[PDB]
Enzyme design. Structure first.
Site, PDB file in Angstrom:
ATOM      1  N   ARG A   1     -40.459   1.582 -11.715  1.00  0.00           N
ATOM      2  CA  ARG A   1     -40.293   2.911 -12.307  1.00  0.00           C
ATOM      3  C   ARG A   1     -40.239   2.827 -13.820  1.00  0.00           C
ATOM      4  O   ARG A   1     -39.567   1.962 -14.383  1.00  0.00           O
ATOM      5  CB  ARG A   1     -38.995   3.562 -11.820  1.00  0.00           C
ATOM      6  CG  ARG A   1     -38.487   3.029 -10.499  1.00  0.00           C
ATOM      7  CD  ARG A   1     -38.847   3.894  -9.320  1.00  0.00           C
ATOM      8  NE  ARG A   1     -38.010   5.084  -9.291  1.00  0.00           N
ATOM      9  CZ  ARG A   1     -37.477   5.601  -8.187  1.00  0.00           C
ATOM     10  NH1 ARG A   1     -37.685   5.031  -7.003  1.00  0.00           N
ATOM     11  NH2 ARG A   1     -36.740   6.699  -8.274  1.00  0.00           N
TER      12      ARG A   1
ATOM     13  N   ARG B   1     -29.833   1.454 -13.379  1.00  0.00           N
ATOM     14  CA  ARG B   1     -31.061   2.193 -13.597  1.00  0.00           C
ATOM     15  C   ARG B   1     -32.010   1.283 -14.369  1.00  0.00           C
ATOM     16  O   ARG B   1     -32.014   1.261 -15.601  1.00  0.00           O
ATOM     17  CB  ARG B   1     -30.781   3.480 -14.389  1.00  0.00           C
ATOM     18  CG  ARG B   1     -32.051   4.280 -14.670  1.00  0.00           C
ATOM     19  CD  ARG B   1     -31.822   5.529 -15.510  1.00  0.00           C
ATOM     20  NE  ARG B   1     -31.063   6.541 -14.785  1.00  0.00           N
ATOM     21  CZ  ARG B   1     -29.749   6.687 -14.874  1.00  0.00           C
ATOM     22  NH1 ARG B   1     -29.038   5.889 -15.668  1.00  0.00           N
ATOM     23  NH2 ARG B   1     -29.143   7.620 -14.155  1.00  0.00           N
TER      24      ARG B   1
ATOM     25  N   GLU C   1     -25.132   8.124  -7.172  1.00  0.00           N
ATOM     26  CA  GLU C   1     -26.104   8.076  -6.088  1.00  0.00           C
ATOM     27  C   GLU C   1     -26.420   6.651  -5.723  1.00  0.00           C
ATOM     28  O   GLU C   1     -26.618   5.795  -6.580  1.00  0.00           O
ATOM     29  CB  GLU C   1     -27.409   8.767  -6.465  1.00  0.00           C
ATOM     30  CG  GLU C   1     -28.483   8.607  -5.405  1.00  0.00           C
ATOM     31  CD  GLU C   1     -29.831   9.111  -5.855  1.00  0.00           C
ATOM     32  OE1 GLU C   1     -30.837   8.818  -5.165  1.00  0.00           O
ATOM     33  OE2 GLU C   1     -29.886   9.802  -6.897  1.00  0.00           O
TER      34      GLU C   1
ATOM     35  N   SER D   1     -30.796   8.258  -0.789  1.00  0.00           N
ATOM     36  CA  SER D   1     -31.274   9.625  -0.687  1.00  0.00           C
ATOM     37  C   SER D   1     -32.185   9.834   0.535  1.00  0.00           C
ATOM     38  O   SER D   1     -33.124   9.063   0.766  1.00  0.00           O
ATOM     39  CB  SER D   1     -31.993  10.004  -1.972  1.00  0.00           C
ATOM     40  OG  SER D   1     -32.298  11.381  -1.964  1.00  0.00           O
TER      41      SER D   1
ATOM     42  N   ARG E   1     -28.305  -0.859  -6.751  1.00  0.00           N
ATOM     43  CA  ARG E   1     -27.077  -0.094  -6.687  1.00  0.00           C
ATOM     44  C   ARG E   1     -26.084  -0.540  -5.622  1.00  0.00           C
ATOM     45  O   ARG E   1     -24.864  -0.461  -5.832  1.00  0.00           O
ATOM     46  CB  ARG E   1     -27.417   1.379  -6.565  1.00  0.00           C
ATOM     47  CG  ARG E   1     -28.252   1.818  -7.746  1.00  0.00           C
ATOM     48  CD  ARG E   1     -28.457   3.304  -7.800  1.00  0.00           C
ATOM     49  NE  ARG E   1     -29.116   3.681  -9.044  1.00  0.00           N
ATOM     50  CZ  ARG E   1     -29.426   4.929  -9.387  1.00  0.00           C
ATOM     51  NH1 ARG E   1     -29.134   5.943  -8.577  1.00  0.00           N
ATOM     52  NH2 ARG E   1     -30.026   5.162 -10.548  1.00  0.00           N
TER      53      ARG E   1
HETATM   54  N1  LIG Z   1     -34.219   3.195 -11.761  1.00  0.00           N
HETATM   55  C1  LIG Z   1     -33.564   2.751 -10.701  1.00  0.00           C
HETATM   56  N2  LIG Z   1     -32.884   1.582 -10.761  1.00  0.00           N
HETATM   57  C2  LIG Z   1     -32.223   1.111  -9.693  1.00  0.00           C
HETATM   58  N3  LIG Z   1     -32.219   1.793  -8.543  1.00  0.00           N
HETATM   59  C3  LIG Z   1     -32.879   2.969  -8.430  1.00  0.00           C
HETATM   60  C4  LIG Z   1     -33.574   3.478  -9.513  1.00  0.00           C
HETATM   61  N4  LIG Z   1     -34.137   4.623  -9.135  1.00  0.00           N
HETATM   62  C5  LIG Z   1     -33.807   4.837  -7.858  1.00  0.00           C
HETATM   63  N5  LIG Z   1     -33.038   3.820  -7.425  1.00  0.00           N
HETATM   64  C6  LIG Z   1     -32.492   3.637  -6.048  1.00  0.00           C
HETATM   65  O1  LIG Z   1     -33.458   4.238  -5.087  1.00  0.00           O
HETATM   66  C7  LIG Z   1     -32.757   5.290  -4.394  1.00  0.00           C
HETATM   67  C8  LIG Z   1     -33.715   6.397  -3.980  1.00  0.00           C
HETATM   68  O2  LIG Z   1     -34.443   6.896  -5.105  1.00  0.00           O
HETATM   69  P1  LIG Z   1     -35.528   8.086  -4.924  1.00  0.00           P
HETATM   70  O3  LIG Z   1     -36.734   7.090  -4.563  1.00  0.00           O
HETATM   71  O4  LIG Z   1     -35.505   8.487  -6.498  1.00  0.00           O
HETATM   72  O5  LIG Z   1     -34.867   8.906  -3.889  1.00  0.00           O
HETATM   73  C9  LIG Z   1     -31.698   5.763  -5.385  1.00  0.00           C
HETATM   74  O6  LIG Z   1     -30.645   6.424  -4.682  1.00  0.00           O
HETATM   75  C10 LIG Z   1     -31.183   4.430  -5.871  1.00  0.00           C
HETATM   76  O7  LIG Z   1     -30.361   3.822  -4.871  1.00  0.00           O
END
Ligand SMILES: Nc1ncnc2c1ncn2[C@@H]1O[C@H](COP(=O)(O)O)[C@@H](O)[C@H]1O
Ligand SMILES: Nc1ncnc2c1ncn2[C@@H]1O[C@H](COP(=O)(O)O)[C@@H](O)[C@H]1O
Lengths: 447, 447
Positions: free
Chosen positions: A283, A298, A370, A373, A412
């Protein structure tokens, strides 16, 4: 992508949802869409009118062949019909592209159960679990965020932040990572590397016991699977593209999993299709360049075991509810107190119809963050990737529903374990459930 | 990068290594670099001469001040001097650029024991191990490559290729990966996913027991760490660069592992630094787009546990031997027959001084294939990344030597396991050493 039908049969429903979401600059689109749709139909009805003419003008030149046949005119009237017909067809063609352009750019319609709000402050806590360890100095913030509905214990000493813990634990090297790659990248070391792998296996074993098929997908995919998985805004903010190639680094296994059956018609007798993928995630995190927690909370890359589900529209919500609980089970075994939250309209996102997040209590930070999700995407991705299914080989195939949910994103999960299982000296005890995977039962500081 | 001092003091030595490497074109560079270096060195002298001359003329024009001061002549000189110093200075920078251009594209000096040869055909077997299962139809090639120095047994049935086994075993989907990402990508499924993780963990544990500190590095690095780990040729053939960013997807943990200590002066007391990295790997594999093996033997992404060693020059050779053996040990426990070949000049590569490869006997393919490779890079990477050490704060720092070697690259280890452990019916038995990691003792076919 939104179904043109839904817009034709309820523009008000979309315009108001568009408002609950805050996408005000897009309600004007609803009208734009319908007036184009309307034009599209009119030109089509003219084409038919014209095709029919083609016929009459045809039988005529003939009926006149057995006569004086001055059909020299009708032949010209014929040449213009095919001319118009073509023009219309092409005109209709463009008209569809404009309609689809808006359709691909419209957020899913939210479920009636999602609270209305502006942002993350409006998300609504709907459940809590565990006995949080709270520093005397966070007592109020905790009680506010927990709404008093969560069991806690006060702490004498001040709990440390995960970044500091990794340090005293010899578990990471940020500086050298910055020299080699830049900010928000890192080198993970020693026990922390075993813990990372351990968390993947743990997660992986459990979803497998629940019947999910384990998959390791491509970490790089073609553009259509990325645009079929999220909103185009993501290509700027989150997705990395590789030079000179139609390849994008996946930000989550969710995407290649959803792409796995693009352009197919599944057999209803197989649904639900249950997948549990593992993959590094990439990301850009463009929106920030440094916010606050400066360790591995992050970052640009992290490992994540993801739950993905293909279901019948009638089963999705029940599944949405199952996957979120699958994630909840893991953290309970990991002994991580948390609260699950219903994300409101303004923080929901384009892909989801409804979303549950698990925010773990972070003793060191003094807050819930968070950690997982779960989203029900209904038919939004399906309509884009063309993922349909049929039960009876003679009927019109219908779009399926897709769902995804974190199982464990090591990054996390690791901060949560470090912050929730730390002792005064820095020693971090490892949740008993991971022992079979780590070997060691705790990580002690180095000296 | 080669040391300019080496080229000066021993030009014949490097020309001969080049000729031995058959790098017949670059041999001219030796003389060229020499020619430029002398000009570069002279002008440097010239510049110092002029600067000192300028001062002696600065104190003198001021001396004539208290005299007749017909300095209108000295003045004209002092201007010619600064004009010359300026001109010289630029010629110097240009000279340095041309010289470094060559220094950075010159292969490492091979160790006298590396055999001369045109390609992998001339690579030399120096040791064998295990009892190979050989198909009767492959007997000649087997004896050919085994030199008849390896125990074996003939199979009356034709052992299958790993690609097929993957299909009958239900552990991969290639068609969908091609849809989703393109060719040479794949989806690993079910027990093959667990086997993949189990191999990473198995390698990690063995290397940790031998005292290597485990690390998970950045999967993307800045161009310099890449230019510091291999020859520039790799940017075209192997390394993926991310769009609009000074970031490159790593083709192996070896690179960020080498970059980790770039620009440092380690403390001799800490040498040797032993690292065992884990990470996904990305390769363009440009010289191909279709060759022969169509499974996961030559793909765009795979996982690999890598051994990296920071060492004192006088210890590097003893380490090159210890790491190839660490890898041998893993494959022996994995029960994979193999041979280890000493790599020749033509299949050697730019950064290694000497190299050993472990080629696993592949029952289905009927031949030995590279499964692990180990190199001693001496000071080639060290000179590029500026990695030095000192035992005393007094002494001049000198370059360390670096060595790298595969522990287990899951992709090829999985093909080796599938092909060497299949049975007539197609099921594969997993070596015992892995049971503690896979749970399952073998993988049987599906409908
Ligand atoms: N930049 C990041 N760095 C570390 N973990 C992340 C990051 N972005 C998302 N996550 C992890 O991926 C999960 C789901 O992200 P999403 O794919 O945005 O729903 C989040 O709740 C975190 O546990
Ligand atoms: N393109 C590839 N696909 C799968 N495995 C590879 C690939 N390239 C290299 N490997 C594995 O990585 C090992 C070390 O390769 P190298 O980094 O080129 O020295 C090889 O011996 C293989 O086991």
């Amino acid at each position: 992508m939104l179904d043109i039908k839904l817009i034709r049969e309820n523009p008000e429903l979309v315009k108001n949802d568009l408002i609950k979401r805050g996408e005000l600059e897009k309600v004007k689109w609803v009208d734009e869409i319908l007036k184009l749709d309307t034009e599209w139909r009119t030109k089509l009805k003219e084409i038919n009118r014209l095709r029919h003419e083609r016929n009459k003008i045809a039988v005529e030149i003939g009926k006149r062949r057995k006569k004086g046949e001055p059909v020299d005119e009708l032949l010209a009237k014929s040449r213009e019909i095919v001319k118009r017909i073509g023009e219309l067809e092409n005109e209709v063609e463009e008209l569809k592209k404009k309609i689809d352009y808006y359709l691909w750019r419209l957020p899913n319609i939210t479920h009636p159960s999602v609270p209305v709000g502006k942002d993350e402050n409006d998300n609504v806590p709907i459940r809590f679990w565990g006995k949080a360890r709270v520093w005397k100095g966070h007592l109020e913030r905790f009680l506010e965020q927990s709404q008093g509905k969560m069991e806690y214990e006060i702490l004498e000493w001040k709990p440390k932040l995960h970044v500091d813990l990794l340090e005293i634990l010899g578990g990471a090297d940020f500086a050298r990572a910055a020299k080699v790659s830049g900010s928000r990248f890192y080198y993970l070391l020693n026990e922390i590397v075993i813990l990372d792998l351990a968390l993947i296996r743990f997660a992986l074993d459990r979803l497998i016991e629940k019947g999910f098929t384990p998959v390791i997908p491509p970490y790089m995919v073609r553009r259509f699977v990325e645009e079929g998985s999220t909103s185009f805004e993501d290509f700027e903010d989150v997705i990395y593209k590789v030079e000179d190639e139609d390849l994008y680094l996946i930000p989550t296994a969710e995407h290649p999993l959803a792409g796995m059956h693009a352009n197919e018609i599944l057999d209803g007798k197989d649904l639900p299709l249950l997948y549990v993928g593992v993959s590094p995630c990439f990301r850009k995190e463009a929106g920030t360049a440094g916010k606050d927690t400066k360790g591995i909370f992050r970052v640009h890359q992290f490992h994540k075991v993801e739950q993905f589900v293909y279901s019948r529209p009638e089963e999705s919500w029940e599944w949405h509810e199952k996957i979120i609980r699958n994630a909840e089970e893991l953290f309970q075994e990991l002994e991580i107190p948390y609260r699950v939250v219903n994300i409101c309209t303004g923080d929901l996102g384009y892909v989801a119809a409804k979303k549950y997040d698990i925010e773990a209590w972070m003793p060191g930070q003094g807050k819930f963050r968070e950690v997982v999700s779960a989203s029900n995407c209904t038919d939004w991705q399906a309509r884009r990737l063309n993922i349909r299914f049929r039960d009876r080989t003679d009927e019109k195939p219908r779009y399926v529903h897709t769902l995804n949910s974190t199982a464990i994103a090591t990054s996390r999960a690791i901060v949560a374990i470090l912050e929730n299982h730390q002792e005064e000296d820095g020693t971090v005890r490892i949740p008993k459930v991971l022992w079979k995977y780590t070997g060691f039962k705790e990580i002690v500081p180095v000296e």
